[PDB]
Amino acid sequence: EESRNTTVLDTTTTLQSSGFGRAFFGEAFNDLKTLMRRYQLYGQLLLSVTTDKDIDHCMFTFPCLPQGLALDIGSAGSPHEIFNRCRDGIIPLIASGYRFYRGDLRYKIVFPSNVNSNIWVQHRPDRRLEGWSAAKIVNCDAVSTGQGVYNHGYASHIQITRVNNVIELEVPFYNATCYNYLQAFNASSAASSYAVSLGEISVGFQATSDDIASIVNKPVTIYYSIGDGMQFSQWVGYQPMMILDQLPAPVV
Amino acid sequence: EESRNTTVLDTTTTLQSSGFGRAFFGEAFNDLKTLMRRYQLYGQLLLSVTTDKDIDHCMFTFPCLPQGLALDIGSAGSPHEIFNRCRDGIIPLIASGYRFYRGDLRYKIVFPSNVNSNIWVQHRPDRRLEGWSAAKIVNCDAVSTGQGVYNHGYASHIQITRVNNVIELEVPFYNATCYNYLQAFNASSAASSYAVSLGEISVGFQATSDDIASIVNKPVTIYYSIGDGMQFSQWVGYQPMMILDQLPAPVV
Amino acid sequence: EESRNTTVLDTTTTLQSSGFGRAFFGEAFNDLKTLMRRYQLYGQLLLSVTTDKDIDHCMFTFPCLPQGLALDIGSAGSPHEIFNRCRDGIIPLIASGYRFYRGDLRYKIVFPSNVNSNIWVQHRPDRRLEGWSAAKIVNCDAVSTGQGVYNHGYASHIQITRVNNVIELEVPFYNATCYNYLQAFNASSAASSYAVSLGEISVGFQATSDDIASIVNKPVTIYYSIGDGMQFSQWVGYQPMMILDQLPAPVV
Amino acid sequence: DNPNPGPDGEGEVELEKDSNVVLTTQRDPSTSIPAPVSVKWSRWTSNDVVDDYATITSRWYQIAEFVWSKDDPFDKELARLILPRALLSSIEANSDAICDVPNTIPFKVHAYWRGDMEVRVQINSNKFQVGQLQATWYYSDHENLNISSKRSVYGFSQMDHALISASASNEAKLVIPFKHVYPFLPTRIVPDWTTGILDMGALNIRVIAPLRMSATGPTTCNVVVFIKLNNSEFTGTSSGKFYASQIRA
Amino acid sequence: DNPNPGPDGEGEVELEKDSNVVLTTQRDPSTSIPAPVSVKWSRWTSNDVVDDYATITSRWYQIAEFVWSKDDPFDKELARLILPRALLSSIEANSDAICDVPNTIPFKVHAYWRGDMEVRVQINSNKFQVGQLQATWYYSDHENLNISSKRSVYGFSQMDHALISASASNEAKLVIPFKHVYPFLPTRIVPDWTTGILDMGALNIRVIAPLRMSATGPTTCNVVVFIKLNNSEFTGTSSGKFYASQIRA
Amino acid sequence: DNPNPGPDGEGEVELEKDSNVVLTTQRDPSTSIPAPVSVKWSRWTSNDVVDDYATITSRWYQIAEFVWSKDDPFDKELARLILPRALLSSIEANSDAICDVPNTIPFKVHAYWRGDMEVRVQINSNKFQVGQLQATWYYSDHENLNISSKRSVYGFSQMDHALISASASNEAKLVIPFKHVYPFLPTRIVPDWTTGILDMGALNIRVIAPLRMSATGPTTCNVVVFIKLNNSEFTGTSSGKFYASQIRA
């Protein structure tokens, strides 16, 4: 009783279909998966080293989920101007209009330039996601459990910064479920926490205490596409939006 | 507009039909004529002789009608306990649910035992029935008209009490009508009185004044079936009934 | 939504159709054109000569239109008793129930008897009819314009009174229109005045001043049929009628 | 399923055209037939000229009109008509003779009658009115003395009947064939038949659901009963002066 | 016969889609056609470029709306529109020029016109309201001086007309072909034609049954009239400055 | 198009006869199906005896009745039922155990469940009442924290839903298949699943058009919700003493 039509009072004629721009621009913008495989910024951070780190310590950690992180506006003094000004990207705006997903993701991590050190990246699909709080890029500041340490059995890859300071990887779907939730997650049970993100990506440097001083306050950006075999499987309508050019200007 | 069904809301399944007890008991109780051919008590009386009777005098008289007599509860001192306790039989209870009849009847009259005298039974289809009053067994106490006398031309039969003190006879349908009334008759005209009962059965003894002293206060019972070729031809609903175990008990 | 029938509740049987009197009288009164080709009085007048007339002067003039003239009741002293008593004829009563016409007319003019003079009749289809006023028989009393004069080019005919004092002529349809108006004409424009009557018939005598004295106060009657090829082309309902035997009698 | 009313009202009139009398019904009739169609019986007991008059006897004619109000209880009789008597008594209740109506002029001149009947009970109730009536036919009412305890809607529902709902404003057709002890009903005083002359039983209209409405609704409604004698046969041509008026009741 | 309303209302919309204007009717139209369909007549009296503009002239456009109340007597006229004048006068009554509506821009620039008409008279009355109106078309009203005694529903019922019942809330379609003495109507002041410019007659809506209701019913209802010029032909291309405004009336 | 009401009322009853429970509807249901029909999944994660009980679980049983009045604003929720919890909580709200209803006795004894649903939302509104409700199903309501800004008829109209008009008094059928992250919902406290036991999401009935009427119209109306579990499968036969009562809410 949603898409019904009682009486269609057509006063129009036939309009020439362009095929979603394929006639004009040589490309059809109908398949939305083609749009979602364009990369979009997952996040950015400035590297900060509080305690003395070993070679095994991970530099930062983040859960890997397609509907985008908790929107990091930044500090009140120094806000991240991308997430503050133009609030959110295309891919989570599409993913807000669905409930469930199943499939892989694609992450492209861009490291700073003047660093040379060899970088390891692990994917741990063990970390359940406990609430929408702490669903963000987390600077590892201490090592108590096996979280900070480069572990053995996970899917890892090492990028040589001397050759190229960007890594391009594909995170697979490893949950034991039919789907996962595709909204701002509210933790009710313990089993529901296993089914939010695909896994948990930890990026670490092999630098020592002397070479880590050149890495402090350097930016690391993370981009993500949607991959392929990536299916959204329940239509949910959109939440209240916000208009972007109605936001106030930084007057002087 | 009586047996209609607007919407039958069947929540049931198919129930196995027994064929009105033919599966269990070897006999189908569907034909109600089979029930009505079972004998049922037409009445009972105690013989009482007031005046000196001749051989020709009839002992008692009664109209022969299928819907049962005026229900003789008896005297207040000595009530007839069959018609007082269990009010009425099956055959008039069925005949109350119809309006018209046509056909024969079957009468079985049981006489007392220690009497020996030869008994005559006449059927006179001449006596019109004048009102529901005096539609009962009438003790002939005097002979004024040709009512008390054994007449010539009627259908008669003589039962020998020395051989057997029960007579089994069939009263035929002799009215000049299409039907007869099958309710408590209310006399409006004179022609309607000809069409209530089939006829009028008179039973008389051939005893003299000396042998009639052994016959006083002896019971005579009259039973009747419905015969065959006996058809009820107009559906009339039932009158207000009365529940029998709601009747009061003779407390001491 | 005029001749509709929702539910016809016929309680009748079949009535034998006479064919509009053809069975009884040998003639069918169904075609109303057959009725309208019977002659009916267009008007009557008494000839009156005020000024001295030449041979060229017309004696009287009248527009030729099928819906009948402005109904001349006559003077209050001497009323024309035909138009006063039985108000109007059949042909304009039929023509009141239509809006438009197209076709010819037939005029039969009966002149007085004791006159001998040769009579000319012209038809001028040039005279536009200016209002329902002066749509009547007009006695030509003076000659200012070319109206009084016998003109050259019109369709004319001369009747010899010595042979026969009646003329029988056919006025043709000469308007440049699709139809003409068939009601009491109200002049709005100048072009609508060209499309009321067919033309304008002028009748004149060739008598001199000595023989015209025998013509004064003599009656001239004008009759008209409807002609053929005469079609009424728009149904208009009838106006309020008046009942004729409800008119008062000339009591003494 | 697609309504489109016009100047006519979007209806469908059902017609009963019986010998120059036409009855119209907007609704569908609720019929009930007590007995199957009877046979003609001029063979067995008549030698006189036996002839119906179907042009004047198979016509419709009103025999009762009454006012069903909201001031009537649950089980309350509205009409009780002994129909062959009720036709003549409805004419005589209008204060004239029986020879002034073409329906009953053979009853003036003949002696006996047998024919079937057609009864139309038409209500004129508003759509917002709520109530329901029975139209129960009973053969030979007067020949049963315990009928005074029988006249109730509980007993009359057991035999077949016609229901009239005040909401739908429907109609009750009653095909009543001749079913009597004797195959003819006398029209006048005839030998050994002095009372109950031409009586075949009572059509009695009672209430099931009393007339219910709002506080300011239309209080009453009207009910009209029409009768038809279709399969008649008249025998025993006699003088009209032997005939007497019916019992008033 | 089996109603099942839903969120849509269980109806059936009839559509009149004529050049990007769509009219909707719930009910069935009550049509009436006075004269048969006319012929084109550019053959006999025109040599100029003769062309209709069916994309802009065969559209629907309202020419009158009015309020039929319960305070109107039996025989009382509600509307009297000289339709070719009434289109232009309904535009000029809204206080603008005639070149602001696409229906009438050939009337500004041409001289003569011939075409048929389609008139829709739509009432918006409640189902509980009771009343009835006529929609009678009369050719060339002003050319008859005894029309002041003619304007009544007794006379207009004799010629064909369209009935509008307030209960059914039905609709009146009026197919009016061109029937006039001259085969063209001038749009402006033309030689020997100074008054009655572009007048073909009066559509006059009168009352038969005045609007009846309860004590607290809805008092009034609204009636809107739409017009269409379908079989038009425009001849005599001229200057627009020669055109003058219509008579107010 | 030709109405003829009788003693029955001229209707057409639609029947839903599901395991000795019969539901009747006068109107046509307005269906809405969120997801296509699910598959049985006893193959992949169960070795226990897996069996539905279609004679007792595919029956109809009321889970909510409420009173929609005219004192409700535009966007106001009337019902918000977490349906697998709401069945058990509607039984426990009637103050008894869960083993007294034949619909829910396998929930007492089994551990997990998967099956589709059928929801009937029946309104009993007068024909003169005016209003409209949504019947929107949302999968896994509690797993979204921004749902408190989502619960409105503007957002619920975007996903598919069922509309209930108070004028037509129509009905909302809701075919809800099993769509969840895990292929089974536990009926009791099970390992690493302590809260949100047997929750699949919220059926929430809100108002679009508030109930409008005259000054003296019927103020309220009633809404009843029935549920059916048709394609069920029960696995993990366990003790009934391990089961605990649902959260009250």
PDB file of all heavy atoms in Angstrom, chain B residues 4 6-12, chain F residues 7-8 13 15 17 20 22 24:
ATOM      1  N   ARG B   4     -32.311 -20.331   5.313  1.00  0.00           N
ATOM      2  CA  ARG B   4     -31.249 -19.681   4.564  1.00  0.00           C
ATOM      3  C   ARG B   4     -29.954 -19.655   5.370  1.00  0.00           C
ATOM      4  O   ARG B   4     -29.941 -19.824   6.591  1.00  0.00           O
ATOM      5  CB  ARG B   4     -31.654 -18.255   4.194  1.00  0.00           C
ATOM      6  CG  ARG B   4     -31.829 -17.346   5.396  1.00  0.00           C
ATOM      7  CD  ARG B   4     -32.161 -15.925   4.981  1.00  0.00           C
ATOM      8  NE  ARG B   4     -32.417 -15.070   6.136  1.00  0.00           N
ATOM      9  CZ  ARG B   4     -31.473 -14.415   6.804  1.00  0.00           C
ATOM     10  NH1 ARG B   4     -30.204 -14.514   6.435  1.00  0.00           N
ATOM     11  NH2 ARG B   4     -31.799 -13.659   7.843  1.00  0.00           N
ATOM     12  N   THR B   6     -26.539 -17.072   5.248  1.00  0.00           N
ATOM     13  CA  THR B   6     -25.826 -15.950   4.651  1.00  0.00           C
ATOM     14  C   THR B   6     -24.344 -16.272   4.525  1.00  0.00           C
ATOM     15  O   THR B   6     -23.781 -16.223   3.427  1.00  0.00           O
ATOM     16  CB  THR B   6     -26.028 -14.681   5.482  1.00  0.00           C
ATOM     17  OG1 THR B   6     -27.422 -14.362   5.537  1.00  0.00           O
ATOM     18  CG2 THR B   6     -25.271 -13.516   4.864  1.00  0.00           C
ATOM     19  N   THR B   7     -23.707 -16.606   5.642  1.00  0.00           N
ATOM     20  CA  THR B   7     -22.290 -16.940   5.677  1.00  0.00           C
ATOM     21  C   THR B   7     -22.078 -18.071   6.673  1.00  0.00           C
ATOM     22  O   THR B   7     -22.292 -17.889   7.877  1.00  0.00           O
ATOM     23  CB  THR B   7     -21.450 -15.724   6.064  1.00  0.00           C
ATOM     24  OG1 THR B   7     -21.657 -14.675   5.110  1.00  0.00           O
ATOM     25  CG2 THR B   7     -19.978 -16.085   6.096  1.00  0.00           C
ATOM     26  N   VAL B   8     -21.664 -19.229   6.174  1.00  0.00           N
ATOM     27  CA  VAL B   8     -21.386 -20.381   7.022  1.00  0.00           C
ATOM     28  C   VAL B   8     -19.918 -20.348   7.418  1.00  0.00           C
ATOM     29  O   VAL B   8     -19.032 -20.537   6.577  1.00  0.00           O
ATOM     30  CB  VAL B   8     -21.738 -21.693   6.306  1.00  0.00           C
ATOM     31  CG1 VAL B   8     -21.357 -22.884   7.170  1.00  0.00           C
ATOM     32  CG2 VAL B   8     -23.216 -21.728   5.968  1.00  0.00           C
ATOM     33  N   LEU B   9     -19.661 -20.101   8.695  1.00  0.00           N
ATOM     34  CA  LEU B   9     -18.297 -19.975   9.206  1.00  0.00           C
ATOM     35  C   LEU B   9     -17.837 -21.290   9.832  1.00  0.00           C
ATOM     36  O   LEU B   9     -17.706 -21.431  11.048  1.00  0.00           O
ATOM     37  CB  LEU B   9     -18.218 -18.817  10.193  1.00  0.00           C
ATOM     38  CG  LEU B   9     -18.461 -17.478   9.494  1.00  0.00           C
ATOM     39  CD1 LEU B   9     -18.623 -16.345  10.483  1.00  0.00           C
ATOM     40  CD2 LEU B   9     -17.320 -17.187   8.536  1.00  0.00           C
ATOM     41  N   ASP B  10     -17.591 -22.266   8.960  1.00  0.00           N
ATOM     42  CA  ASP B  10     -17.192 -23.603   9.382  1.00  0.00           C
ATOM     43  C   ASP B  10     -15.755 -23.648   9.879  1.00  0.00           C
ATOM     44  O   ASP B  10     -14.813 -23.458   9.103  1.00  0.00           O
ATOM     45  CB  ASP B  10     -17.370 -24.600   8.236  1.00  0.00           C
ATOM     46  CG  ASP B  10     -16.980 -26.013   8.628  1.00  0.00           C
ATOM     47  OD1 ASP B  10     -17.735 -26.650   9.392  1.00  0.00           O
ATOM     48  OD2 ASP B  10     -15.918 -26.485   8.170  1.00  0.00           O
ATOM     49  N   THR B  11     -15.581 -23.904  11.171  1.00  0.00           N
ATOM     50  CA  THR B  11     -14.274 -24.165  11.755  1.00  0.00           C
ATOM     51  C   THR B  11     -14.032 -25.649  11.989  1.00  0.00           C
ATOM     52  O   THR B  11     -13.041 -26.011  12.632  1.00  0.00           O
ATOM     53  CB  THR B  11     -14.123 -23.399  13.073  1.00  0.00           C
ATOM     54  OG1 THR B  11     -12.796 -23.575  13.585  1.00  0.00           O
ATOM     55  CG2 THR B  11     -15.138 -23.889  14.096  1.00  0.00           C
ATOM     56  N   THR B  12     -14.900 -26.509  11.471  1.00  0.00           N
ATOM     57  CA  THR B  12     -14.875 -27.935  11.751  1.00  0.00           C
ATOM     58  C   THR B  12     -14.229 -28.706  10.608  1.00  0.00           C
ATOM     59  O   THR B  12     -13.800 -28.138   9.601  1.00  0.00           O
ATOM     60  CB  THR B  12     -16.294 -28.462  11.971  1.00  0.00           C
ATOM     61  OG1 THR B  12     -17.019 -28.398  10.739  1.00  0.00           O
ATOM     62  CG2 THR B  12     -17.016 -27.610  12.989  1.00  0.00           C
TER      63      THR B  12
ATOM     64  N   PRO F   7     -32.416  -9.128   4.328  1.00  0.00           N
ATOM     65  CA  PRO F   7     -32.169  -9.395   5.752  1.00  0.00           C
ATOM     66  C   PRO F   7     -30.718  -9.713   6.080  1.00  0.00           C
ATOM     67  O   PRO F   7     -30.344  -9.658   7.257  1.00  0.00           O
ATOM     68  CB  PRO F   7     -33.067 -10.608   6.038  1.00  0.00           C
ATOM     69  CG  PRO F   7     -34.112 -10.569   4.977  1.00  0.00           C
ATOM     70  CD  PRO F   7     -33.414 -10.050   3.760  1.00  0.00           C
ATOM     71  N   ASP F   8     -29.894 -10.045   5.089  1.00  0.00           N
ATOM     72  CA  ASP F   8     -28.483 -10.323   5.311  1.00  0.00           C
ATOM     73  C   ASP F   8     -27.614  -9.076   5.250  1.00  0.00           C
ATOM     74  O   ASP F   8     -26.612  -9.005   5.969  1.00  0.00           O
ATOM     75  CB  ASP F   8     -27.986 -11.347   4.288  1.00  0.00           C
ATOM     76  CG  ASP F   8     -28.601 -12.718   4.494  1.00  0.00           C
ATOM     77  OD1 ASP F   8     -28.940 -13.050   5.649  1.00  0.00           O
ATOM     78  OD2 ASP F   8     -28.747 -13.461   3.501  1.00  0.00           O
ATOM     79  N   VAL F  13     -18.496 -11.666   2.622  1.00  0.00           N
ATOM     80  CA  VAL F  13     -17.557 -11.905   3.711  1.00  0.00           C
ATOM     81  C   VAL F  13     -16.330 -12.625   3.171  1.00  0.00           C
ATOM     82  O   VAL F  13     -16.444 -13.675   2.529  1.00  0.00           O
ATOM     83  CB  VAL F  13     -18.228 -12.725   4.825  1.00  0.00           C
ATOM     84  CG1 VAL F  13     -17.241 -13.022   5.939  1.00  0.00           C
ATOM     85  CG2 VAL F  13     -19.452 -12.000   5.356  1.00  0.00           C
ATOM     86  N   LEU F  15     -13.005 -14.723   4.228  1.00  0.00           N
ATOM     87  CA  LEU F  15     -12.721 -15.632   5.330  1.00  0.00           C
ATOM     88  C   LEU F  15     -11.236 -15.951   5.368  1.00  0.00           C
ATOM     89  O   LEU F  15     -10.618 -16.176   4.323  1.00  0.00           O
ATOM     90  CB  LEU F  15     -13.528 -16.924   5.191  1.00  0.00           C
ATOM     91  CG  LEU F  15     -15.046 -16.806   5.287  1.00  0.00           C
ATOM     92  CD1 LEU F  15     -15.697 -18.144   4.989  1.00  0.00           C
ATOM     93  CD2 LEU F  15     -15.450 -16.310   6.658  1.00  0.00           C
ATOM     94  N   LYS F  17      -9.510 -18.857   7.327  1.00  0.00           N
ATOM     95  CA  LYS F  17      -9.709 -20.050   8.145  1.00  0.00           C
ATOM     96  C   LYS F  17      -8.355 -20.727   8.305  1.00  0.00           C
ATOM     97  O   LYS F  17      -7.871 -21.391   7.384  1.00  0.00           O
ATOM     98  CB  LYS F  17     -10.736 -20.982   7.503  1.00  0.00           C
ATOM     99  CG  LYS F  17     -11.093 -22.214   8.329  1.00  0.00           C
ATOM    100  CD  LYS F  17     -10.424 -23.481   7.814  1.00  0.00           C
ATOM    101  CE  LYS F  17     -10.814 -24.679   8.660  1.00  0.00           C
ATOM    102  NZ  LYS F  17     -12.272 -24.963   8.554  1.00  0.00           N
ATOM    103  N   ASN F  20      -8.760 -24.031  12.825  1.00  0.00           N
ATOM    104  CA  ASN F  20      -9.989 -23.872  13.615  1.00  0.00           C
ATOM    105  C   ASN F  20     -10.200 -22.464  14.167  1.00  0.00           C
ATOM    106  O   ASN F  20     -10.967 -22.291  15.122  1.00  0.00           O
ATOM    107  CB  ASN F  20     -10.140 -24.963  14.710  1.00  0.00           C
ATOM    108  CG  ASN F  20      -9.224 -24.821  15.968  1.00  0.00           C
ATOM    109  OD1 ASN F  20      -8.766 -23.758  16.381  1.00  0.00           O
ATOM    110  ND2 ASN F  20      -8.964 -25.971  16.578  1.00  0.00           N
ATOM    111  N   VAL F  22     -11.353 -18.728  12.573  1.00  0.00           N
ATOM    112  CA  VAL F  22     -11.891 -18.122  11.360  1.00  0.00           C
ATOM    113  C   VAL F  22     -12.000 -16.624  11.599  1.00  0.00           C
ATOM    114  O   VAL F  22     -12.639 -16.194  12.566  1.00  0.00           O
ATOM    115  CB  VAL F  22     -13.257 -18.705  10.972  1.00  0.00           C
ATOM    116  CG1 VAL F  22     -13.811 -18.005   9.742  1.00  0.00           C
ATOM    117  CG2 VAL F  22     -13.149 -20.199  10.735  1.00  0.00           C
ATOM    118  N   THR F  24     -13.217 -12.941   9.847  1.00  0.00           N
ATOM    119  CA  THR F  24     -14.144 -12.446   8.840  1.00  0.00           C
ATOM    120  C   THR F  24     -13.839 -10.984   8.558  1.00  0.00           C
ATOM    121  O   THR F  24     -13.601 -10.206   9.485  1.00  0.00           O
ATOM    122  CB  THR F  24     -15.599 -12.589   9.301  1.00  0.00           C
ATOM    123  OG1 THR F  24     -15.805 -11.802  10.479  1.00  0.00           O
ATOM    124  CG2 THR F  24     -15.917 -14.038   9.614  1.00  0.00           C
TER     125      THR F  24
END
